[PDB]
């Protein structure tokens, strides 16, 4: 996670789509959903990113509705956005023990207990935090079993990006969890 504001330039696809759902949080605009194989995923937008501006207009105070409208009326060719990198999230680096364990329990993507004398304890992983990413891969909406799977088939070094559950629950509010499973970009990025 960067402490950084970056510029991205987006191009609407054949269908007029960019692959993004946005949400009003604390008078800012945040990425709720990035669609697989979209302009939004290709330029590298992520769940939890803050949209500071669209085409040089400040997003401060916008409704979710107005952000979606502004995008719909954009002139196709080139949409500029100013992005602050996942500001509600932190990344924790942990190392599996020889039993392949980092040292926590989670339910519905939420960390619920840290196991004594584990890598997760030593690194101060918190409970009541949703798992957003594992090793740079979005896992939001994946079954718990697929999250376990991704942690199994990772190397011994495990990076997990987390979000306080209260913030997470505010962002995905009014997104049916099957769009989350189905349409949230879970791909490793392209180069």
């Amino acid at each position: 996670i960067k402490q950084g504001i970056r510029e991205v330039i987006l191009c609407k696809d054949q269908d007029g789509k960019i692959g993004l759902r946005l949400k009003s949080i604390d008078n800012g605009i945040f990425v709720q959903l990035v669609q697989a194989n979209s302009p939004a995923s290709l330029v590298g937008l992520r769940f939890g990113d803050q949209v500071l501006q669209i085409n040089g207009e400040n997003c401060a105070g916008w409704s979710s509705d107005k952000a979606h409208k502004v995008l719909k009326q954009a002139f196709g060719e080139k949409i500029t956005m100013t992005i602050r990198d996942r500001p509600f999230e932190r990344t924790i680096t942990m190392h599996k023990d020889s039993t392949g364990h980092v040292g926590f329990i989670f339910k519905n993507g939420k960390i619920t207990s840290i196991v004594k004398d584990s890598s997760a304890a030593r690194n101060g992983l918190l409970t009541e935090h949703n798992i957003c990413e594992i090793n740079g891969q979005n896992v939001i909406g994946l079954k718990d079993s697929q999250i376990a799977d991704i942690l199994s088939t990772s190397g011994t070094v495990v990076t997990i990006t987390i979000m306080p559950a209260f913030i997470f629950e505010h962002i995905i509010k009014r997104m049916a969890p099957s769009i989350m499973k189905s349409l949230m970009d879970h791909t490793i990025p392209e180069v």
Side-chain angles (χ1 to χ4, degrees):
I1 297 186
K2 316 150 206 188
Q3 301 207 4
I5 298 178
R6 82 177 174 273
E7 174 153 310
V8 306
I9 292 134
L10 257 174
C11 208
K12 281 170 159 168
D13 70 11
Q14 277 176 304
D15 312 342
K17 289 182 177 159
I18 56 166
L20 214 46
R21 290 286 280 174
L22 300 177
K23 178 79 174 70
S24 179
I25 306 288
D26 294 340
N27 285 298
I29 289 295
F30 291 86
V31 176
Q32 184 193 62
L33 262 169
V34 186
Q35 192 175 11
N37 334 296
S38 71
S41 47
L42 274 173
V43 304
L45 295 181
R46 296 193 275 292
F47 179 83
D49 274 346
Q50 182 179 1
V51 190
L52 293 199
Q53 291 144 310
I54 292 175
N55 278 332
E57 253 158 50
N58 294 325
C59 303
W62 287 8
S63 65
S64 325
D65 281 350
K66 176 189 195 171
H68 290 146
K69 195 167 225 193
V70 157
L71 290 180
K72 206 187 168 149
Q73 298 170 226
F75 284 47
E77 166 67 7
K78 180 208 165 159
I79 306 199
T80 74
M81 309 195 116
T82 296
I83 295 317
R84 188 185 300 272
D85 168 44
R86 290 169 296 168
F88 294 128
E89 293 158 71
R90 289 185 295 116
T91 301
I92 309 275
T93 295
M94 294 167 291
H95 309 299
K96 283 153 123 169
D97 63 15
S98 46
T99 329
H101 289 97
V102 297
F104 66 92
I105 298 156
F106 75 92
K107 204 206 171 194
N108 301 117
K110 197 176 77 160
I111 301 158
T112 49
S113 71
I114 316 295
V115 184
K116 272 133 189 153
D117 302 335
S118 74
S119 192
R122 278 190 289 283
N123 287 280
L125 197 54
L126 295 182
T127 63
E128 200 50 15
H129 278 66
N130 278 264
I131 298 176
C132 297
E133 319 182 358
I134 299 180
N135 301 326
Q137 180 151 246
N138 185 319
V139 305
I140 294 177
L142 298 182
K143 273 156 179 140
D144 286 346
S145 61
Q146 296 173 285
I147 290 165
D149 282 352
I150 293 191
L151 286 167
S152 285
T153 77
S154 169
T156 55
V157 180
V158 180
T159 294
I160 80 168
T161 302
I162 62 168
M163 186 181 290
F166 186 48
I167 299 166
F168 186 90
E169 284 307 328
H170 192 183
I171 285 172
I172 69 163
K173 227 139 225 195
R174 306 298 199 287
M175 179 174 46
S178 84
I179 308 156
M180 247 195 308
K181 198 168 112 73
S182 305
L183 278 154
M184 179 83 68
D185 170 48
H186 302 116
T187 58
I188 288 172
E190 152 188 352
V191 179

